[PDB]
Symmetry: C4
Subunit: 49 residues, 4 copies
């Protein structure tokens, strides 16, 4: 139960990393998106005043 | 082998818990992020067209 | 049982810990994504005042 | 085996906290990112508008 029942830590890390990397990537994507839906749009309201 | 059949249930039950919070966070961020677009395109239609 | 109580222990002890991180992450996302309208609805009014 | 194998929670809490603190730093990073861009862009428009 020592050299075998360590999967509860390891197998969960495989899960928690996948959810973390999907969270980390999605936050980065959506935040970069809003930054490209701001600096792209503010340059248009500035290009007309 | 109650050992193997138990550690698989722990990984499973926690997977269902861990997957639940990810989806809750995923939908929350996606909902909030799209809401921030609803408050960004609302100014482009207002301050560019009509001012 | 004896192994069902140690399986329910680590599952429960982690379930609230994940709920600790999840609800905390939920608070961070909500807080800041609630500020971005405080930094828009209060910021749009300045562009509406001068133009 | 004795009674408790709390290293399961321990060495997993090492993972949950590490991924959380990473996601904690990520959200705090982007929320500060869009904050400067909320200020720099707003102050940029206030010149000619
Ligand atoms: Hg065990
Ligand atoms: Hg929407
Ligand atoms: Hg910045
Ligand atoms: K990138
Ligand atoms: K669904
Ligand atoms: K609606
Ligand atoms: K044991
Ligand atoms: K800052
Ligand atoms: Na804690
Ligand atoms: Na905490």
């Amino acid at each position: 139960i020592n050299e075998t029942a360590d999967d509860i830590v390891y197998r969960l890390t495989v899960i928690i990393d996948d959810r973390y990397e999907s969270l980390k990537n999605l936050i980065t994507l959506r935040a970069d998106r809003l930054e490209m839906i701001i600096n792209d749009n503010v340059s248009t309201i500035l290009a007309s005043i």
